[PDB]
Design a protein around this ligand. Structure first.
Ligand SMILES: OC[C@H]1O[C@@H](O[C@H]2[C@H](O)[C@@H](O)[C@@H](O)O[C@@H]2CO)[C@H](O)[C@@H](O)[C@@H]1O
Ligand code: CL
Length: 415
């Protein structure tokens, strides 16, 4: 007997790590778990095709932001039973619990697997040579921009590249998500969507959201981000940070784990950046401090022929032992709140900064139409980045683009 599991590349050897994670389960149940690894870029298509076609695995990893969308298609097995065996609502951060179902659904359709949230990695050697105190740079928007200005005027050169660093790297080219943009929207007092007595609408074109978006996009128009970096997706920006090409960038806690892994095994431990690595939270904006809080859950397709055995695997993957071990293998945080207390997370100095930054963590609402909203937002945000690359992003042009994005988003939400 066999379970099929789909997962995304959460660890450097995603298939091998997952297999090693489920080995005790395989031994004890006398079952094989076959895993297929999907790139995040193809995962949405593969999972929605399994949903519509009725062909796919027993279990899939689902980004937290996708749970609502796939759940609304009516294809997921209820897992209230698994969540009750794992300790129920009390055992989860309420922000994590809200990702176990479509907003306002009767039944849970996803088991929390891991959490991740966003902060700034920074080069400790570069900030020092620029005369930047990270406690000032990462306090406030004004401290953030003043730090980038000292980084731009720095005479520091990476000891391996023999070249200057860019103050900030952020991806322009593949905006697959709003995750990079959301903290800036939120810190201005904005939102991506807003509910008015029931109905959801875009707030991307609200004065507050436009203020946050303009603040962030204009850092790049001011010369703090190289034009190069707007050519690049997330994976290429990570590589540029690892190769010593920039002083600061936003990512999740997986980069700490990759930094202690040799290059031979998919890490960057021998690079200067890994040996001079700091983490600081997103700076507070004029209306508050927020960061993107997400992660992945696991779900069971209602066409599975092995629902009992698959629920046993969900309970195992959701539980204390597998929660600590998978978070170690990935550099993610446990989804299970109790597991955060494991000394191996609490005593990691860079990871403790992610753990404290979770006080300000913020999630998207769990909407049926979420896939559509994110897809439409990034399409329009992509065009704003195109204006940045040409030095032509004005507040008027940004507003014009988010007015169009909001019409597209509202039309999709009315369905
Ligand atoms: O939007 C899909 C989910 O994204 C998750 O973050 C991913 C990101 O998409 C990848 O590009 C790569 O960087 O890995 C990240 C961590 O898995 C996010 O955690 C989820 O909440 C989203 O649903
Ligand atoms: Cl929002």
């Amino acid at each position: 007997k066999t379970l099929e599991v789909w997962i995304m590349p959460n660890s450097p050897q995603p298939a091998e790590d997952f297999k090693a994670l489920v080995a005790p389960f395989e031994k004890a149940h006398g079952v094989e778990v076959k895993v297929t690894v999907l790139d995040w870029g193809v995962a949405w298509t593969k999972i929605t095709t399994a949903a519509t076609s009725g062909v796919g695995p027993d279990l899939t990893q689902l980004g937290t932001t996708w749970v609502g969308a796939i759940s609304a298609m009516g294809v997921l097995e209820p897992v209230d039973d698994v969540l009750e065996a794992l300790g129920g609502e009390k055992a989860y951060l309420p922000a994590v619990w809200r990702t176990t179902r479509l907003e306002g659904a009767r039944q849970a359709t996803a088991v929390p697997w891991f959490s991740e949230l966003r902060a700034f990695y920074y080069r400790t050697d570069a900030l020092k040579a620029a005369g930047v105190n990270p406690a000032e740079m990462f306090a406030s928007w004004q401290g953030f921009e003043a730090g980038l200005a000292r980084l731009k005027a720095s005479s520091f050169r990476d000891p391996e590249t023999k070249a200057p660093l860019a103050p900030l790297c952020t991806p322009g080219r593949t905006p697959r998500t709003l995750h990079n943009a959301a903290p800036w929207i939120w810190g201005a007092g904005g939102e991506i969507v807003r509910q008015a007595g029931g109905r959801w609408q875009s707030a991307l074109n609200s004065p507050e959201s436009l203020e946050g978006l303009y603040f962030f996009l204009s850092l790049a128009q001011k010369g703090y981000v190289p034009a190069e970096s707007l050519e690049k997706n997330t994976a290429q920006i990570e590589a540029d940070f690892q190769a010593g090409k920039c002083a600061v960038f936003a990512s999740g806690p997986w980069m700490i784990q990759r930094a202690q892994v040799p290059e031979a095994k998919g890490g960057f431990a021998e690079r200067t950046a890994a040996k001079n690595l700091g983490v600081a939270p997103y700076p507070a904006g004029p209306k508050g401090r927020y960061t993107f809080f997400g992660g992945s859950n696991l779900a069971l397709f209602n066409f599975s022929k092995n629902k009992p055995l698959a629920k046993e695997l969900l309970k195992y993957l959701g539980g204390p032992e597998a929660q600590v071990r998978y978070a170690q293998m990935t550099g993610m945080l446990p989804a299970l709140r109790s597991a955060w207390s494991d000394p191996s997370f609490q005593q990691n100095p860079l990871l403790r900064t992610f753990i404290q930054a979770a006080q300000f963590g913020r999630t998207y609402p769990s909407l049926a139409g979420w896939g559509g909203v994110e897809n439409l937002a990034v399409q329009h945000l992509g065009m704003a980045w195109d204006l940045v690359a040409q030095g032509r992003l004005t507040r008027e042009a940004l507003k014009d683009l988010m007015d169009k994005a909001s019409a597209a988003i509202n039309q999709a939400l009315r369905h």
